Amino acid sequence: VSRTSIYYYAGSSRLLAVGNPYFSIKSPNNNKKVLVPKVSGLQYRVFRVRLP
Amino acid sequence: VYLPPVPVSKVVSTDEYVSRTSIYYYAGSSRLLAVGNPYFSIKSPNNNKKVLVPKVSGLQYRVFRVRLPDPNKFGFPDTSFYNPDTQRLVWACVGLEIGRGQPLGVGVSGHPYLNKFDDTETSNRYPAQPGSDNRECLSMDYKQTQLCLIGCKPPTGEHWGKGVACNNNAAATDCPPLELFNSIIEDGDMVDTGFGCMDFGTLQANKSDVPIDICNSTCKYPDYLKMASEPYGDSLFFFLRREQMFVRHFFNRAGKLGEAVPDDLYIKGSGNTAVIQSSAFFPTPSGSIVTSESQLFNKPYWLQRAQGHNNGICWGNQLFVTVVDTTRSTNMTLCTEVTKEGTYKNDNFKEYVRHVEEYDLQFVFQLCKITLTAEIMTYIHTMDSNILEDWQFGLTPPPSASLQDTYRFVTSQAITCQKTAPPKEKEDPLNKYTFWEVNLKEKFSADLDQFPLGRKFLLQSGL
């Protein structure tokens, strides 16, 4: 591997992240989609960033 | 084919065009006097708009707006080092000190109708209690908070409240959307103690689970990301912050369980377990131990370069400082008897409770004379017309014109009404808002060595 001196910025904006601590709630009598997901911080947190 | 989309003119920090001198000027104030009730301003009961006894707590926000005299409206013996025509003059803060001459101590409070149900700390035996009114008189504590922050622009608040709803929709409950709002941190409003940064009037139908001073309030959070987002560097020059917290006990809410748990994840029981108990738990905010050594204050704090593009430089002769201390937020207690006897009864005595704070300051600055060129005068009005017009120099028209006449008439409003928009100069956006204000314009001093920070300073500089 070589090395260039060509540096670049990468910065995101604000994110939407809010919701239910305990469990996802499906649509009643549909139960294929969900109304509000389980949103909990003690879970692991992965994000698939997309870079050029 | 792909290309760089846009070329943009460059921004430059306030160092290279800023021509620094070596002449320094002092700031420092006398004894502060401001007091009030810890929980609520006593209205006069007849006229409940004017106060009887005010309100102040350590849990209130403490933001301050300062006032400084004009550098150009000053008498000096020797203007030899610069042209008064070609140069302008401006202040930046380089020497800083904030202390408080009170002892420590945190105030404790609570709420007399607290909506508790049962002890989820150690034991909840089965079955549970009924009751229509299950409120009690209990107290609670707070997370310990210290910070110190400084910029020429006011600190921004951000705070919770209700959110973007949708149309007439079918298969959901009240799943309430929530959208944050932004503001500016004002003075007197309450801060957070770990309960989320929302309004407590619009979200408390009971208002019987929230403490008494925050029973209607709206506590904010500082938008550290968005305050790191402005490339002026003028809303923050330097910051410190320090907090600590743990929790003592655990209890649950009391009411109709708004949403239900699916039975897939537990066994249904009967008898004592034919019911399903309320389980909307919460912690007990406590905070922690205090030292004489974890302080953020009462020391010399020299600055060498402010954290953004502005180098500690004031505009409009003002700054904006925020300090929190619940550490010195303990409260006094009064007792006056009404009658006299040789026999003790509790119905003889009258008890008041107050909350006191003192603040003090000491600063030193340095003159940076600023010459005025063509590339300079184009640069400032893109930021502000306001910092230009003070110099009484002249005016640049913001257009040179446009390509539209925009429907010229002479005939003065007889058939079809349109918007005419009568403006007002209004002379400040801050005219609706309250901060704590102070003067410097006759506390002026060039000498430093009568003053402990200036006595602290000249050993840094060795002069």
UniProtKB/Swiss-Prot annotation, chain A:
Q: Which domain of life is it from?
A: Viruses
State where the protein is found.
Answer: Virion; Host nucleus
Give the protein's function.
Answer: Forms an icosahedral capsid with a T=7 symmetry and a 50 nm diameter. The capsid is composed of 72 pentamers linked to each other by disulfide bonds and associated with L2 proteins. Binds to heparan sulfate proteoglycans on cell surface of basal layer keratinocytes to provide initial virion attachment. This binding mediates a conformational change in the virus capsid that facilitates efficient infection. The virion enters the host cell via endocytosis. During virus trafficking, L1 protein dissociates from the viral DNA and the genomic DNA is released to the host nucleus.
Family assignment from sequence similarity: Belongs to the papillomaviridae L1 protein family.
Assembly mode:
Self-assembles into homopentamers. The capsid has an icosahedral symmetry and consists of 72 capsomers, with each capsomer being a pentamer of L1. Interacts with the minor capsid protein L2; this interaction is necessary for viral genome encapsidation. Interacts with protein E2; this interaction enhances E2-dependent replication and transcription activation.
Q: What is this protein called?
A: Major capsid protein L1
Query: From which organism does this entry originate?
Result: Human papillomavirus 58
